[PDB]
């Protein structure tokens, strides 16, 4: 008891300089049943990380009814094939149009300048299909 926060793991994703502009990387966080994407957007956005403050990461499970969304490089969005929700990767997962009542959850990355490491350390929002982000 005493604890109000979830016990998120710290998972290495990659080093920032490996990431190419607008080429998504796949990983799992906070466990292997939670698919995620990190992407270097190419221009700074609020809360972006890395050397160009432009790296962002998300849970790809649609917050409507949980289908895996796909990243669209032309629009920098995540599209759900289920009922056509679309989320803005440049606006912290803001729903552009769709049937969700929650933004696409952001995976919180630490960027360590010393090592160039990007580490997933938490989640902002509730991942689809879960009582808590950490099962």
């Amino acid at each position: 008891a005493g604890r109000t926060t979830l016990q998120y793991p710290a998972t290495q994703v990659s080093v920032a300089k490996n990431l190419k502009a607008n080429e998504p990387v796949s990983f799992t966080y906070p466990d292997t049943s939670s698919p995620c994407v990190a992407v270097k957007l190419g221009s700074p956005v609020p809360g972006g990380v890395g050397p160009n403050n432009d790296i962002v990461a998300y849970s790809v499970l649609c917050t409507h009814m949980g289908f895996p969304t796909s990243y669209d490089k032309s629009s920098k969005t995540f599209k759900c094939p289920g009922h056509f929700t679309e989320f803005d990767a440049e606006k912290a997962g803001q729903m552009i149009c769709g049937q969700a009542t929650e933004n696409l959850p952001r995976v919180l990355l630490r960027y360590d300048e010393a090592s160039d490491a990007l580490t997933a350390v938490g989640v902002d929002g509730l991942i689809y299909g879960r009582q808590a982000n950490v099962i």
């Binding site: 917050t63 409507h64 949980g66 056509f84 606006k91 729903m95 929002g125 879960r130």
Partner: protein, 824 residues
């Protein structure tokens, strides 16, 4: 607070039924309620959802987010978790939730949530400030003014604009309560409806032709060969009808069922035709699902619907793609309509702008006999693009002609239906006047002493809204100034002061509402109302399916169900007249001895057509008495489609799936009647705006935003996404005006001026725009005209204006997505 977990409902949590508060579809939901300091276990048999939260859930297993949860604080001060989630076994939605219904838990009243500014007590503008007042004082002032007006001017001095709809802020209890009050007790004809400025119908023509506008089932959309969506953006406006019924048809998942019902009939891949000037999200999504070859977008010129349907009707008649036996046995007027409505494809094409090949293809898909010999089953769905279109009455004449000739009513997989707006829930006395009155014009012209907005906000939603607001604010100010002189007056003296100010151009304004709204800028008196879940409420959806939404919590403060507000008013007025020794006037206010909303159900819906009952117009018809609360509860979220045909304890309520299947229509002779539909171009008032100004100012709904945003204006996610009403503009037009996404523009014409944030949209045609209607920041209706059809139905979609850059809102550019809302 925390964004990364939710409290599960315990296995034994209380569970009640709730219909969605909002749109016509009326999706079914369950409300779980349990004490704040209990919770369910993750094992599936240790929570009320029966879902296994010990590992990741698959897609489609649930719809659950924090927005679907809340903690309420009841009148006993105790705190309860609630969870409002879609019912997987409801036939309407099969466990689907729109983004709007999904937020119901968040928009339940709590002292600290999105509902924080709910009206909790009577509010009085005491000349120069808002204060609280008691219900008794409020009724003394409100009933006192009504009484004074009745005594000296008669009913013609008492004005209302009132909901006539279903769902939240409507329904059978509420429409009866208000209707009985306005029509049987006060007996005023000075009443308009929430969305239209007279006591009229959206569907005069179809009804007069013998076809009530809700004539099918949602299952018919699953059985259709072809669906027309006319003046309609259903993915955004009737989401779960489109997702749960239309799309499965397009995807081929209903083909089995068609072939099982009709063994000797070809069923090609289903196709969909949209008649809409604008390329909408619904067009885009239909093409993604069915392919480009199975979708036809007839991107007509604004206001040309009548010419489209006349050209189609002419063509199917010339091709012989009509049902001659049907016409001969069950219709009147066909031969006349052929002549009056004659229009060649070439002329049709020139007026509508649609190429002849596309007009022919629409007809081929929809009306040319299938190989097995039967006509396609073509369901014709329409909404506000033509209800608020260029001559409501004439467009429906034109469309219904095509439908009747092609036998697309009364066959399964057909129907010529409204898609609907709100849910339906109408039970009222007859309107007491003999003429249609343009209420807004009467108010603008200085008539009436007291005006009540009841469950509506015409400041945001009137046509010619700027003229209305100007006048009401001024008239309101006269009353405020008059009240100002008073000091130490009795309630009765104040009534006299206010009455006198109304002889000098004033108007006393009351609002009965959930929230202050923009009406608070002019209101003198606001009364707190209760919404479903804080009360029992009955309503039906677009296939006439009646459900009970069960009470599960207390209203904020002394908020009350609207039917009980109406009983309170009636009983105040009665007491006043009894005390004044006017027995005959007192008796007009009898029959409001109501303790609960169910009393209003029993007095209204359940008395319709019964012996000893007064005249009652009810969507439940004369078998409404077969419905009780208890019986609805046992039916669940599936309810019963009205009208009820029988009931017994062993089989429950048994209802009606489709109307007109035997060829007997609601006319004197039982036949469907064809009507002439002349093409006269745009109305002069509208054509003048078009001649003077550049842009067609189309307007309507956004998927995420409900109506006047009365809840959404308090929702931080909604406000971040849509801080201001937006206007879709063609990018080439944008460059010409040097605007981009997140700029602010003034939109104006001879009728008014308003503002919007620019939303460049590639799919918008040059010279055309689309602005969100009804909103809290930039009211679109300022630039709509005063023009109405013969029945005082506004052409809300018919206005032109100019656009002027105000400037760049950097904050909107940083926070708002201007990405495309048309999925591909």
């Amino acid at each position: 607070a925390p964004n990364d977990r939710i409290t599960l409902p315990p296995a034994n949590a209380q569970r009640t039924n709730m219909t969605c508060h909002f749109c016509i579809v009326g999706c079914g939901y369950h409300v779980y309620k349990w004490p704040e300091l209990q919770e369910g276990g993750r094992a599936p048999e240790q929570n009320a959802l029966g879902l296994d939260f010990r590992k990741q859930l698959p897609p489609l297993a649930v719809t659950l987010t924090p927005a679907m949860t809340n903690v309420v604080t009841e009148h006993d001060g105790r705190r309860y978790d609630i969870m409002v989630v879609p019912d997987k076994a409801c036939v309407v939605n099969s466990g689907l939730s729109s983004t709007r219904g999904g937020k119901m838990a968040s928009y339940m009243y709590t002292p600290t949530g999105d509902g924080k500014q709910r009206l909790k007590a009577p509010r009085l503008y005491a000349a120069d400030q808002w204060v609280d007042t008691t219900w008794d004082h409020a009724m003394a002032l409100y009933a006192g003014l009504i009484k004074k007006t009745l005594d000296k001017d008669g009913p013609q001095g008492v004005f209302f604009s009132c909901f006539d709809h279903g769902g939240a802020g409507g329904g059978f209890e509420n429409t009866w309560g208000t209707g009985k009050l306005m029509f049987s007790a006060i007996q005023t004809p000075m009443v308009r409806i929430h969305n239209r400025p007279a006591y009229n119908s959206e569907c005069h023509a179809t009804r007069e032709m013998g076809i009530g506008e809700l004539n099918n089932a949602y299952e018919d959309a699953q059985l259709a060969d072809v669906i027309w969506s006319i003046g309609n953006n259903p993915y955004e406006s009737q989401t779960n009808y489109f997702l749960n019924h239309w799309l499965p048809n397009l995807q081929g998942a209903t083909t089995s069922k068609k072939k099982e019902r009709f063994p000797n009939e070809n069923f090609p891949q289903a196709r969909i035709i949209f008649v809409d000037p604008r390329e909408t999200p619904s067009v885009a999504i239909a093409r993604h699902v069915a392919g480009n070859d199975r979708v036809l977008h007839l991107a007509i010129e604004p206001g040309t619907d009548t010419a489209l349907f006349n050209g189609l009707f002419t063509y199917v008649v010339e091709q012989g793609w009509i049902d001659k036996p049907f016409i001969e046995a069950h219709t009147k007027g066909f031969d006349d309509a052929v002549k009056t409505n004659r229009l060649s494809l070439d002329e049709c094409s020139n007026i509508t702008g649609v190429p002849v090949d596309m007009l022919k293809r629409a007809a081929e898909w929809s009306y040319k006999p299938k190989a097995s010999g039967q006509a396609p089953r073509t369901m014709h769905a329409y909404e506000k693009g033509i209800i608020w279109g260029n001559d409501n009455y004439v467009i429906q004449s034109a469309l219904l002609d095509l439908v009747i000739a092609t036998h697309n009513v009364g066959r399964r997989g057909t129907g010529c239906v409204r898609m609907g707006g709100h849910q339906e829930g109408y039970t009222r006395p007859p309107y007491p006047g003999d003429k249609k009155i343009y209420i807004d014009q009467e108010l603008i012209k200085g008539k009436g002493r007291i005006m009540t907005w009841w469950g509506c906000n015409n400041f945001q939603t009137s046509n010619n809204a700027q003229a209305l607001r100007e006048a009401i604010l001024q008239r309101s100010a006269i009353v405020k100034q008059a009240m100002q002189k008073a000091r130490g007056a009795t309630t009765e003296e104040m009534v006299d002061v206010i009455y006198e100010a109304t002889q000098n151009g004033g108007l006393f304004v009351t609002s009965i509402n959930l929230y202050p709204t923009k009406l608070a800028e002019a209101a003198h008196l606001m009364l707190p109302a209760a919404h479903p879940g804080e009360m029992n409420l009955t309503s039906m959806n677009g296939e006439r399916r009646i459900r009970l939404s069960e009470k599960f919590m207390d209203p904020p403060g002394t908020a009350m169900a609207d039917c009980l507000i109406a009983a309170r008013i009636a009983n105040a007025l009665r007491d006043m007249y009894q005390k004044d020794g006017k027995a005959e006037m007192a008796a007009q206010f009898e029959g409001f001895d109501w303790k609960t909303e169910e009393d209003a159900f029993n007095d209204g819906f359940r008395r319709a057509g019964q012996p000893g009952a007064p005249a009652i117009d009810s969507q439940g018809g004369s078998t409404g008495h077969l419905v009780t609360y208890d019986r609805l509860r046992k039916s669940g979220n599936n309810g019963v489609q009205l009208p009820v045909v029988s009931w017994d304890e062993s089989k429950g309520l048994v209802g009606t799936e489709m109307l007109y299947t035997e060829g007997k229509f609601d006319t004197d002779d039982g036949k469907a009647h064809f009507k002439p539909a002349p093409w006269n171009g745009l109305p002069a008032t509208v054509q003048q705006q078009k001649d003077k100004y550049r842009f067609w100012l189309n307007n309507g709904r956004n998927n995420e935003v409900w109506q006047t945003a009365y809840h959404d204006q308090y929702n931080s996610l909604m406000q971040e996404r849509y801080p201001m009403a937006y206007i879709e503009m063609n990018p080439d037009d944008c460059k010409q005006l040097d605007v981009t996404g997140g700029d602010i523009v003034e939109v104006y014409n001879d009728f008014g001026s308003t503002f919007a944030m620019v939303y460049p949209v590639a799919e918008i045609k040059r010279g055309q725009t689309f602005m969100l209607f009804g909103y809290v920041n930039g009211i679109q209706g300022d630039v709509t005209t005063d023009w109405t059809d013969r029945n005082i139905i506004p052409y809300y979609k018919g206005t032109w204006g100019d656009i002027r850059k105000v400037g760049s809102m950097e904050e909107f550019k940083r926070t708002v997505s201007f990405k495309s809302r048309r999925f591909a």
